From Swiss-Prot, chains A, B:
Changing C138R: In MLD; adult type; enzyme activity reduced to 50% of wild-type enzyme. Keywords: Calcium, Disease variant, Disulfide bond, Endoplasmic reticulum, Glycoprotein, Hydrolase, Ichthyosis, Leukodystrophy, Lipid metabolism, Lysosome, Metachromatic leukodystrophy, Metal-binding, Signal. This is Arylsulfatase A. It is linked to Metachromatic leukodystrophy: An autosomal recessive disease caused by abnormal intralysosomal accumulation of cerebroside-3-sulfate in central and peripheral nervous systems, as well as other organs. MLD is clinically characterized by leukodystrophy, progressive demyelination and a variety of neurological symptoms, including gait disturbances, ataxias, optical atrophy, dementia, seizures, and spastic tetraparesis. Decreased arylsulfatase A activity is detected in urine, leukocytes, and fibroblasts of affected individuals. Optimum pH is 4.5. Changing P173T: In MLD; juvenile-onset. Changing D11N: In MLD; infantile-onset; causes a severe reduction of enzyme activity. It holds the Pfam family Sulfatase. It catalyses: an N-acyl-1-beta-D-(3-O-sulfo)-galactosyl-sphing-4-enine + H2O = a beta-D-galactosyl-(1<->1')-N-acylsphing-4-enine + sulfate + H(+). Changing P118S: In MLD; late-infantile form. The gene is ARSA. Changing L34P: In MLD; loss of enzymatic activity.
């Protein structure tokens, strides 16, 4: 009975990048087709605009400060990881009998002997890279075949990026023009195996598109008419078209819920090789709408009727909604999301009225940076980020430093989604929205205690995955293409 | 045989305002439905981002400097107007037997005894206001029923806005909450009368939405969830839904070509009561993409198949395309547009490769400000405008004065439609695009001679339309509600 679930999570992709979200040149026909027969959200959100914290929140339904996933993101030498006691969505569904799989980016920790890798967090199967694909040297990697090298080099002084099958290194580094196809093959097998055993499957496809450095297989190199960023988005979109074909071919259309979102807004510091937040302001690394408001699509023919909703939804609501849909029980922990099955099924409204946004570097003295309630969003603190530099808006740059606002900056996102016109720069609707927003911020700051930072437990170069264990010299001996 | 034609032209509406162009809160379901069964253009343009010059170019297929429609816009006391010797599209179709009508904004001149009004330029029927609805006092007008007054007062010291039936004043001023409906009634009658006489009709519906001051009838007041700007856009959209119903009811679906565009980009100086250029830069009054790149839809079931094109098209191409479609002959004048029927019918590509943009205040020493060819756009001069003030981009403000660029600022609009990354800030594709762009600018500047300015022929307060001719005191005695 429980539907099969496929969760596609893109990387560094903005609200204005899909064709269906208005981009003038992107090529995304499969995603456009899913929107046209599915529910397109205009107001869906992640609570923190960086990969690690966002990935933690999506898999646990909890604000990332609760389990220490701050500040910044994890790196290959990190000792820390998402604690093994947090219950992931994967555990929740596995315990109700789903065959569960993950392909692609994890970024939730590696640890001493791979203790934090996915196999330990509820996934039966895993094929991917344990952190972003740019966290290792890439000046010699090919990003576009036959031999266009990746641009800029990526991180130096580290082992090459490992492609892992469960806990074993399959390739180091992998060939980027074919990674995707490896991931579609793995998915195809997970589906079939599950059909075979009469069991519901759960696929978590964390794609590398459209994170720097851009890359694609040869059918897309130079065919999107938006350069490398388009080519990489176009391959992502073709991958979605492949999952939907596989779902067709096994007669699983009406029994599969397919969700598409992305972890955080665009990295505009990659300029024309990064994504686009459309009308929204700034991008990745900030708490402006461009960093935390993502594209989101839900498709389940015969269950979700085609349309557009404006209701509030978050990545935080994913665990509890999917649990409900699977008749799986909720962990016995404080959860920060809700079940949105009534909104999906068209029988109710979203129960979500408020959203809370933390910065990349949060702290317990300042607490939440911004809050949305209804149509009103207040910013109590503002800051730009080097991930959102290079555009003409000075508030997005790294040089717009941390600034306190009291009274907060207050926007009406139904008329001013661009966040340009501070409404306190008076009215009774406004004044009542102000008092609610301040009381929600002070209630959340007083009730959440920050879990001890995983990121500050430090780095140890010995934790890098090495294809040729014990080899020498480290790290360049670690490699098995 | 010739199809019936309905040209809907909106006012001050941006590229990111329709739901189908990505806006998160606008409500435009009829327009979204026309896009879903029609051709949606991602790269359609007007050559000048102000009402008068844009309206002239659309009706004549000629760059507005050729017939003197600069600088700025005409005002109620203007002696000048679009010369009576220019051939409009309306003349062209009337001569092939179309019954032709216009409802709404004209802004192409009034003149001594209404010499420039529409009845003299090929329209058989006319119901509307001869210039924008804000060109007269509005501190006492109702914008939203039952008694919400228009905001800010509009222009002072002038006669109230006249609603005209051909050359006679029907109301002065008209009641804004019902103007629209008057215009749908007139349209409905034009259609029916033409069906009756077995003749093809041509309707030019120049709506007042979404120009300041915003207004709507009671079914839309406060129902769009985007405030007054949404309410006004929502009424516009409901009007489109009414024309399409009338077309249904007379069995004229497959025989009517329906086109939707807008004259110029958004007036962001009205802030949350003005429109949104989406990812594009700046708006009304500039030569950035946000001022000149508009939404555009073409719908003709059984002739135009549903889709999205990225080909180049301009408002300038409208006369010659519609002539071709009607088997009407072209005037014997130099035209600056082309026939895009092959692109509409799906048998050819657009023949347009280049676009030329003039500023609101052009001059023969500086010539064209920007040129697009292929995917490359060069700006030879840049300037902000008080119509595009109040956003965070400093290049859009009135204080960014006229600046020459040599080498020009050069953008790749397929990867950088936001116009952020100057490519000369080297490569052979770039260098060849540069040499083409400079040669196109110098060829057009050398070949176009500016027609003598109509706007500088001056003003005469005696040219104001007065409901009670000879009354006194002028202008406040002029009024007949
Ligand atoms: C590593 O781990 C999983 C689980 O052990 C491997 O398991 C699957 O492999 C085969 C099917 O592909 C079968 O031998 C097993 O039944 C199957 N196990 C389960 C629980 O499904 C898997 O191949 C490896 N991970 C992947 C796909 O890389
Ligand atoms: C004013 O001018 C036109 C043309 O004279 C008027 O003409 C139309 O009015 C009636 C139908 O609505 C008929 O009496 C005429 O046949 C018809 N003329 C043509 C050529 O169609 C019209 O009513 C006035 N304009 C409008 C609609 O306001
Ligand atoms: O924030 N960072 O320091 C950072 C570093 C490397 C990434 O590759 C990255 O992108 S992220 O992993 O998607 O957040 C972010
Ligand atoms: O540019 N102007 O000076 C101007 C004046 C009044 C308008 O109402 C206006 O808007 S316009 O008529 O759409 O261009 C523009
Ligand atoms: Mg990311
Ligand atoms: Mg206008």
């Amino acid at each position: 009975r429980p539907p099969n679930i496929v969760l596609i999570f893109a990387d560094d992709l903005g609200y204005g990048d899909l064709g269906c979200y208005g981009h003038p040149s992107s090529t995304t026909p499969n995603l456009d087709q899913l929107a046209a027969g599915g529910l397109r959200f205009t107001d869906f959100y992640v609570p923190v605009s960086l990969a690690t914290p966002s990935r933690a929140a999506l898999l646990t339904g909890r604000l990332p400060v609760r389990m220490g996933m701050y500040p910044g993101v994890l790196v290959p030498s990190s000792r820390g990881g998402l604690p093994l006691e947090e219950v992931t969505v994967a555990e929740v569904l596995a315990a109700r009998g789903y065959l569960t799989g993950m392909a692609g980016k994890w970024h939730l920790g590696v640890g001493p002997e791979g203790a934090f890798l996915p196999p330990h967090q509820g996934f039966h199967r895993f094929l991917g890279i344990p952190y972003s694909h740019d966290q290792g040297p890439c000046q010699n990697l090919t990003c576009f075949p036959p031999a266009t090298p990746c641009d800029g080099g990526c991180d130096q002084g580290l082992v090459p990026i490992p492609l892992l099958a469960n806990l074993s290194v399959e390739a180091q580094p992998p060939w980027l023009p074919g990674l995707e196809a490896r991931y579609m093959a793995f998915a195809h097998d997970l589906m079939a195996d599950a059909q075979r055993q009469d069991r519901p499957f759960f696929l978590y496809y964390a794609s590398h598109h459209t994170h720097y450095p851009q890359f694609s297989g040869q059918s897309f190199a130079e065919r999107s008419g938006r350069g490398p960023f388009g080519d990489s988005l176009m391959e992502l979109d073709a991958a979605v078209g492949t999952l939907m074909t596989a779902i067709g071919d096994l007669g699983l259309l009406e029994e599969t819920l397919v969700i598409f979102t992305a972890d955080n807004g665009p990295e505009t510091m990659r300029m024309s090789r990064g994504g686009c937040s459309g009308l929204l302001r700034c991008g990745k690394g900030t708490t402006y709408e461009g960093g935390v408001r993502e594209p989101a699509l839900a498709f389940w023919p015969g269950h979700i009727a085609p349309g557009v909703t404006h209701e509030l939804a978050s990545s935080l609501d994913l665990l509890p909604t999917l649990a409900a849909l699977a008749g799986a029980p909720l962990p016995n922990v404080t959860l920060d999301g809700f079940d949105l099955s009534p909104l999906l099924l068209g029988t109710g409204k979203s129960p979500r009225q408020s959203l809370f946004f933390y910065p990349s570097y949060p702290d317990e003295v300042r607490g939440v940076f911004a809050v949305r309630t209804g149509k009103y969003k207040a910013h109590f603190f503002t800051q730009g980020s080097a991930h959102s530099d290079t555009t003409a808006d000075p508030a997005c740059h790294a040089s717009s430093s941390l600034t306190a606002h009291e009274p907060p900056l207050l926007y009406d996102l139904s008329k001013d989604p661009g966040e340009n016109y501070n409404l306190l720069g008076a009215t009774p609707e406004v004044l009542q929205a102000l008092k609610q927003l301040q009381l929600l911020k002070a209630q959340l700051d007083a009730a959440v205690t920050f879990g001890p930072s995983q990121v500050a437990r430090g780095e140890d170069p010995a934790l890098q995955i090495c294809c040729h264990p014990g080899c020498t010299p480290r790290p360049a001996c670690c490699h098995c293409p």
